Amino acid sequence: ITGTSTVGVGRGVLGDQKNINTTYSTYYYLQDNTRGNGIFTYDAKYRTTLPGSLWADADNQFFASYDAPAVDAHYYAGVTYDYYKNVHNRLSYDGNNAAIRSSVHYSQGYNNAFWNGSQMVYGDGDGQTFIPLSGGIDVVAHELTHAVTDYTAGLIYQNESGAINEAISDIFGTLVEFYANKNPDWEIGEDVYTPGISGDSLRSMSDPAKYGDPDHYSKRYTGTQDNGGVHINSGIINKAAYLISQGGTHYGVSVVGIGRDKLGKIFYRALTQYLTPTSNFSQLRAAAVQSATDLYGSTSQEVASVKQAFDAVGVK
Ligand SMILES: [Ca+2]
Ligand SMILES: [Ca+2]
Ligand SMILES: [Ca+2]
Ligand SMILES: [Ca+2]
Ligand SMILES: [Zn+2]
């Protein structure tokens, strides 16, 4: 809408208080005009009709518990936008400052979140397996990174390219959680998953196998569930990114870590520069070795760690 930019305050899903950019014209709207063409948050009102209605508030205070998922969806889309701009000189998900849109309160008891080709969508969860999914910065950044991938490499969402697509979203969701320093870890979804059971998460990058995901290519899922395992085989790539960043020994292969920023730069370059829609894990290894080389030299430690890590997880 057209109006005056202002700043509101509210409480997120985990009860933390934060400031949000709003726009005022009779009502206060969750419309942030300070980032590209804007960040817009919508109420789907427990239906599946999208996007729903632009979130309108009477007094620019967002402390109702109904408001909480909107506060976080709005705030964390902003943080993710800033991460891509400041760390990678990318303006929004398309590189040309496209509007970021999210809808919350999608359906009833819906335990998921997704990018639907045009916008992000967040369920409220059923209160026992999930609470509102936008309460996790790694969840928000994961979903938005799907749009980034769609505008760049265009990884097909099935089999090995699909697992790559999933892993890139886990990798970057984590790097964003670290960038914002929101209690970071190498776990996915720990803040919003199973409120009655602490210390667990949906997926683990540091040890995928903790939840039954492969951490080695020999162990990959070859059937047809989950579009050929896209959320399952991502574990192999997730473990690789973890080793590359933090180091460690995995099936007897030692890896010297090169830290997060270099992991980010290497994978962002692979993604934007070398990956294609049909790329497989072997092509990802090559893309990553080539980015490292481009960035740090044919005989750098960095290139050596990237080689080490992919060997460790069985990807030649
Ligand atoms: Ca209010
Ligand atoms: Ca965390
Ligand atoms: Ca996490
Ligand atoms: Ca939990
Ligand atoms: Zn995903």
For every residue of 156-174, DSSP letters joined together read -SSHHHHHHHHHHHHHHHH
Question: Which residue in the block uniquely carries the two structure tokens 């997926």?
Answer: 203
Could you give the CA distance from residue 268 to residue 40 in angstroms, rounded to a whole number? 26
Give CA–CA dist 136/127, Å, rounded: 15
Q: Ligand 3: distance of its center to the CA of 148 in Å?
A: 19
**189 token code pair:** 């979804």
d(CA 48, CA 100): 19
Which DSSP helix (H) or strand (E) runs through 11? strand 4-11
Written out in words, the top-level CATH class of the domain with range 155-315 is mainly alpha
- Please state whether beta strands 248-250 and 53-54 pair in parallel, antiparallel, or not at all (unpaired): unpaired
Element (H, E) at 141: helix 137-151
The Cα–Cα gap between 251 and 78 comes to 40
- 223: number of Cβ within 10 Å: 8
Contact (CB, 8 A) for 134 and 76: yes
Distance from the alpha carbon of residue 73 to the mean position of ligand 5, in angstroms: 16
User: What CA–CA distances, in Å, run from 285 to 96, 223, 266, 278, 309?
Assistant: 29, 23, 11, 14, 10
Distance CA 232, CA 235 (A): 6
Query: Is residue 53 helix, strand or coil?
Result: strand
CA of 111 to the centre of ligand 4 (A): 14
Separation CA 103–CA 37 (nearest Å)? 17
DSSP letters of 191-216?
Answer: TTB-TTSTT--SEESS-GGGGT--SS
- Cβ atoms 87, 179 nearer than 8 A: yes
Half-sphere exposure of 299 (CA within 13 A, CB side): 0
Known binding-site residues equal: 57, 59, 61, 138, 142, 146, 166, 177, 183, 185, 187, 190, 193-194, 197, 200
Instruction: Please give the DSSP secondary-structure letter assigned to residue 108.
Output: S
The Cα angle at residue 108 between residues 106 and 114, in degrees rounded to 5: 35
Return d(Cα 46, Cα 255) in angstroms, integer: 47
CATH of domain 6-154: 3.10.170.10
Instruction: Tally the C-alpha atoms within 13 A of residue 221's C-alpha that lie toward its C-beta.
Output: 22
- Whether residue 208 is preceded by a cis peptide bond, meaning omega within 30 degrees of 0, is no
Contacts of 171 (CB under 8 A, 6+ apart): 205, 237, 238, 241, 263, 267
Q: What residues contact 169, with CB distance under 8 A and at least 6 apart?
A: 142, 143, 145, 146, 149
**Resolution of the structure in the document, Å:** 2.3
**55 CB neighbour count, 10 Å cutoff:** 25
Give the strand pairing for 61-62 and 56-57.
unpaired
Domain boundaries, the chain: 6-154, 155-315
301-312 and 260-269 helices, crossing angle to 10°: 80
Q: Say if CB 93 and CB 144 are below 8 A apart.
A: yes
d(CA 208, CA 203): 6
What are residue 122's phi and psi, to 5 degrees? -125, 125
Determination technique for this entry: X-ray
Please state whether beta strands 4-11 and 17-25 pair in parallel, antiparallel, or not at all (unpaired).
antiparallel
Phi, psi of 40 (to 5 degrees): -125, 125
Which amino acids are annotated as binding site for Ca(2+), given as ranges?
A: 57, 59, 61, 138, 177, 183, 185, 187, 190, 193-194, 197, 200
- Token pair of 222 as six digits: 């070859």
Closest CA to 34 of 71, 93, 81, 95: 81
Q: Which two tokens stand for residue 300?
A: 């750098």
Give the CA count within 13 Å in the CB-facing half-sphere of 101. 16
Chain centroid to Cα 298, Å, comes to 30
